[PDB]
Design an enzyme around this catalytic site. Sequence first.
Site, PDB file in Angstrom:
ATOM      1  N   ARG A  13      -2.560 -55.102 -60.278  1.00  0.00           N
ATOM      2  CA  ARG A  13      -3.554 -54.286 -60.843  1.00  0.00           C
ATOM      3  C   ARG A  13      -4.051 -53.284 -59.981  1.00  0.00           C
ATOM      4  NH1 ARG A  13      -9.542 -54.535 -60.695  1.00  0.00           N
ATOM      5  NH2 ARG A  13     -10.578 -53.337 -62.339  1.00  0.00           N
ATOM      6  N   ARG A  43     -21.409 -43.477 -62.470  1.00  0.00           N
ATOM      7  CA  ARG A  43     -21.288 -43.723 -60.907  1.00  0.00           C
ATOM      8  C   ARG A  43     -22.352 -42.819 -60.347  1.00  0.00           C
ATOM      9  NH1 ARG A  43     -17.906 -47.673 -58.516  1.00  0.00           N
ATOM     10  NH2 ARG A  43     -16.199 -48.266 -59.968  1.00  0.00           N
ATOM     11  N   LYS A  55     -10.465 -53.705 -72.351  1.00  0.00           N
ATOM     12  CA  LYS A  55     -11.348 -54.469 -71.684  1.00  0.00           C
ATOM     13  C   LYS A  55     -12.798 -54.323 -72.589  1.00  0.00           C
ATOM     14  CE  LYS A  55     -11.777 -53.278 -67.464  1.00  0.00           C
ATOM     15  NZ  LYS A  55     -11.612 -52.440 -66.261  1.00  0.00           N
ATOM     16  N   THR A  57     -13.090 -61.267 -63.106  1.00  0.00           N
ATOM     17  CA  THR A  57     -14.421 -60.671 -62.366  1.00  0.00           C
ATOM     18  C   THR A  57     -15.092 -61.656 -61.834  1.00  0.00           C
ATOM     19  OG1 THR A  57     -14.151 -58.569 -63.579  1.00  0.00           O
ATOM     20  CG2 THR A  57     -15.838 -58.839 -62.261  1.00  0.00           C
TER      21      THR A  57
HETATM   22  O1  LIG Z   1     -14.074 -53.892 -65.288  1.00  0.00           O
HETATM   23  C1  LIG Z   1     -13.904 -54.977 -65.093  1.00  0.00           C
HETATM   24  O2  LIG Z   1     -12.954 -55.551 -64.714  1.00  0.00           O
HETATM   25  C2  LIG Z   1     -15.367 -55.739 -65.166  1.00  0.00           C
HETATM   26  O3  LIG Z   1     -16.483 -54.863 -65.126  1.00  0.00           O
HETATM   27  O4  LIG Z   1     -15.427 -56.984 -64.949  1.00  0.00           O
HETATM   28  K   LIG Z   2     -11.549 -49.432 -63.650  1.00  0.00           K
HETATM   29 MG   LIG Z   3     -15.909 -52.734 -65.812  1.00  0.00          MG
END
Ligand SMILES: O=C([O-])C(=O)[O-]
Ligand SMILES: [K+]
Ligand SMILES: [Mg+2]
Lengths: 522, 519
Positions: free
Chosen positions: B61, B108, B258, B316
Amino acid sequence: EAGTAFIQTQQLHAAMADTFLEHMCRLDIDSPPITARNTGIICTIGPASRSVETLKEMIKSGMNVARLNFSHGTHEYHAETIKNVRTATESFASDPILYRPVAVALDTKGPEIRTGLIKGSGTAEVELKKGATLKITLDNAYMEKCDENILWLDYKNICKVVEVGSKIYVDDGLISLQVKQKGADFLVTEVENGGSLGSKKGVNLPGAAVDLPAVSEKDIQDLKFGVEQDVDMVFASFIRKASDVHEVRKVLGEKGKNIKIISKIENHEGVRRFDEILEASDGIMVARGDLGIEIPAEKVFLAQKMMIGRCNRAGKPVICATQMLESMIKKPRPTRAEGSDVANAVLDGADCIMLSGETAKGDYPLEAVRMQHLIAREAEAAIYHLQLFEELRRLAPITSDPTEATAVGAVEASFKCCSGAIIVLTKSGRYAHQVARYRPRAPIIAVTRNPQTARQAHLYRGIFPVLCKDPVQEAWAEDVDLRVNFAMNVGKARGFFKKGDVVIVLTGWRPFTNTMRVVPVP
Amino acid sequence: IQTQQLHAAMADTFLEHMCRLDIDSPPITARNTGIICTIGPASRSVETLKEMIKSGMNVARLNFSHGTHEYHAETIKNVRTATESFASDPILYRPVAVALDTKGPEIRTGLIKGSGTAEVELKKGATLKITLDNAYMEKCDENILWLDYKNICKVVEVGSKIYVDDGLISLQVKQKGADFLVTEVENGGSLGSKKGVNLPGAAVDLPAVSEKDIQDLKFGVEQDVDMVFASFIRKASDVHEVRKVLGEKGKNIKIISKIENHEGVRRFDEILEASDGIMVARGDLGIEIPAEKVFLAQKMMIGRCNRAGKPVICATQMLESMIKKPRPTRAEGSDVANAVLDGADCIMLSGETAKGDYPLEAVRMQHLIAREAEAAIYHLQLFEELRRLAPITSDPTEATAVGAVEASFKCCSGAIIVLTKSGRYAHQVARYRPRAPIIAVTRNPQTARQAHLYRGIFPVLCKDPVQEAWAEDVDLRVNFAMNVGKARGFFKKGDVVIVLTGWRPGSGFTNTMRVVPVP
Ligand SMILES: O=C([O-])C(=O)[O-]
Ligand SMILES: [K+]
Ligand SMILES: [Mg+2]
Ligand SMILES: O=C([O-])C(=O)[O-]
Ligand SMILES: [K+]
Ligand SMILES: [Mg+2]
C-alpha cells in the site's frame, strides 16, 4: 411525527435476524443501546486511582470491583487503599436508591519471577542490545546491581528448569534472551529482542516446568491479611491444577469460607487442566498478560474463547483481563484494536472486563472506565441472543431442581415480553446467579440485605445489585413488597424502565420457592 | 489432538464450538487471509521488501497523503525489484500487488514553526486561533494553527468541535472571522506537523476526487497499479468519479472504497454495489463516529461484503503498539483474530510497516494470527448461511463452485484448484469460504496480483506457453498447481484435492469438478 424512518433501539432489527450472518449485516451504529450496562467492570487501584476523590468518580463512571494487585505494595499500602475504597463507596450510602456496592478483590503475587534493581538508585534503566551477551545470576550480591552485563532474578531453581537454547522473556515479554551456557548458579544468554530494562520486571520461562508453589508462605500471609480486611474475592495467580485452588481456599479458614475464589489462567498447564480448575473454582480470570507470554501470542484468542465458552456452559463467572485499553495509560482515547477487544470480549460472553495499568498507573483512569462502560453497553445490544439463549438451554441439563426451572422460565419470559428487568430477591446471590447464567438481555436487579452478596454479585453478567437497608418486616408478604418496591424505585431512578413497562419479579425464599410474577411497573 | 481445530469444527452449537477451541491443535500450513502492508521509510528498501514478501506481505500500500510522484515511483520500482527477485523459481514466486491509497478530502494542519520545539504543547483551556492564511502554513504553534480546509468557516459555527491528530486533541470554536476561528483547547497534548483533522459534527464539502487525486489516480494508471483504496467515500457517485478518472485504460483496476465517516456507513449498500470491494478504514471512522460504535460498523460491513461476495479489508491500528515494540498487546492479537473470524478477506498494517521499528515482526504476527483464526472459524454454520442467503440462480458455474466447496469439506481436501483468466471463477469459490486454500492458476499477471483481495485465493502465475491442445493446456496448469501445493506443504501423496476447470473450448462455463488423489 418523523415517520417510518424510526430506528429500533438496542439493535432490535439485528436481534430478529434468522441467521448470524444477517444479524451482523443489520448491526446499526444509529441504533442506541439501552441505559443498563450488564458487564461488570473491574479496576486495578494504584497511584493514579487510590485517592478518595478519584475513587468516587471511578464509581460514578462504572467501577464495580476494586482490584488490589499484591505483586506490588506492602500491607499498609493496601490497607490504606481498601480504607479509601470504602470511604468513597460509603459516601454514596445516604441514598440507598443510588448507592452502588463496590467489591474488593485481592490479586495474589503467586509464583512470579522478578528481576532485581538496576544499579544506582534502582529508578534508572539499561539498554539491552540485540546480539549482546547477558549473564543471569542468582548471587544476591547483584540483587541491586543489575545492568546490561549481569541480571539478578529471584527464582533460585531457575538453572534446573531451563536448558541451553531455552528462551527467557523479561518485562511483559518485550525483552527476549536465549540461553547459550548454563552454570551452577548462573546462565549466559544472548539478547534476541533488546530494549530498555528497568527494575523488578516480570520474567517468563515458556515451556519450562517452573516448580514454585502456587501459594507460597508469603502468599498465605497476604491471604490472611485479605481475610482480616474482609475482601470479597481472591484472584489467584498462575493456577495450574485443581489442588492449587484448594491451597487458596482451605487456607482462608472458616472465617474466609464465603470469599469467592477466582482462578487466574495464565500458563499452558492452567489451560490444559482447565476443566478441573473450573470445577474447583468459583470463577475464572483469563489473565492474558502472562498467558500471551507463556503461550504464543497468536493462540491467546483460542484460550480466551475456550475458557469463556466453558465458563458460560458451567454458569461460573469469567473475567477477561489485561491490555484491553492499554494505550489509554498515556492517551485519552483507545486504539481501534482496543475498542474491538472490549466489544469482542463481551460478545464472547465475558461476565466482567478488567483494567490494570489503565486505572492503576495511567493518566486517564476515568476515561478508561467510561470507555469500558460505553463499549460494553453497545456490545451487549449486539449479542445474538436468539442463538445464544437456544444453545445455553440445550447445553443445560434437565434436573429436578425447581429453582433452575424457575430461572430458565424467567429468562424465557423476559425474552417473550422484552421486559425492562428481572428483579430477584436474593440472600446468598444464588437465585440471581441462576438467572444470569441464561444471559437475559434485560438487567437483573438483585435485591439483597446481605452486604457481601451485594458486592460479590458484580462477578456475574447482568446482575445489578442493590443493597436494601430497611428492617425486615414481620409479615413476609409486606417484606417482599418492600424489597420489590425498592427495586422498582431503583430501576425508575436509573432509567432502566418506566411506569407501565413490564418486568419479571422473582420473590426469593418463602418460609415452593422463588415464585415468578410478570407485572407492569407501578 | 486433532489438528486444524477439527474437534471444534464438528460441534453442533456455536457455544460448544468455542468450548472445543484447543491451543494444542496446530493449524494447516496454508494461510488464507490477505496481508496488506503500507510501505514507507521502514519498509521501502529492496532488501527489507524482500523480507516483507518472505514474511507474508501480499499487497504493498502506497499512501498518497504524503510524498511526491518521484518518491512513489521509486517505491513501486523497489517493490517490483524485490518481487521479481523470486521469479527465477516460478513455483515458489509470489505475486505482489500494488495499491494506491488516495489522499482524498483530507483535512490537515500545517508545519510547526521550525525555530522552536519540534512539537508544541496545547494545554486545556488555552486559546488557539485557527487560520486559513497561508502566511502561517509553515508557522504553526500554540498560538496559531493553520489548516488546509479553506472553506472550514462556512461549515462550522460557534460551539463546533474540532479534532486533531488521530482525534487525540480537541478544540471548541468560540468565535468566527473572515478567514479564521478562535478556539479553546478541550483535550490538550503535543502537536506535530501535518496532522489529520476531523469535524464530526460538520458537513465537510471537499470534493470526493480533488485535482490532486486526479493526478495521483492518473499516475496510478501509468504505473500499472492493481487497485485503488479510495479515501472518504460517502456515496455511490464518489465511486463513479474515481472510476471515471481511471477510465478505459484503468478499467481493470480494482476500486476499494474506504468507509471512514458516518455518511459512508449510512450509504454503504449503494457504495458496495458500485465498488469492487471495501476497506473498513477504522482510523478516521473511529474519530467521525463514537469509538465504541466502530465494531458495529466493522461487523456490519464485513457481513454485507461476505453476503455480496466482494472483498472487505479490516484496517488501521490492528497491531499499533508494534510500531515501537517487538510483540503486540493482547487487545491487538485479539483484534486481528476477530477480524478474521468476522470474515475479513484481508487485514492491513499502516504505521507498523511504514514507519515502525518492527515491520517484519508485524507482518509475521498477522500471518500467524490469521492462520490460527482461520482454523477456528465455525465453517459448519458459515457455509450453511452463505448458501441460504445467496441469490437464486441456475448458473452451472455457481453450482459447480458450491459443489466443490461442499466436496472440499467432505474429504478435508488439501486445496481447491481453479483456472481463471480474470479472477471471477476463483472469486466464486472464495465467496463460499472453504477451509481449504484455493490455488488459482492464471497466466494473467494482474489477475494473479489482484487475487490477494479475496480470502483463501493463493494465486499462482503460470509462465508456460499455451499448449496446442486445450485439454493438454488445462492439464499443464492443473499440474503446476499440484506441484506448487506440494512444494508449499499444502498437501502430499495420499491427500485429496478438488480441481475445477472449464467445460470445453469456446465455453465460459467453469462447470467441471474432479476429486483427485494427490499423486
Ligand atoms: O485511511 C485509513 O486507512 C483510516 O483512516 O483508517
Ligand atoms: K490516504
Ligand atoms: Mg483515513
Ligand atoms: O496477572 C494478570 O492479570 C495477567 O498476567 O494478565
Ligand atoms: K498479581
Ligand atoms: Mg499475570
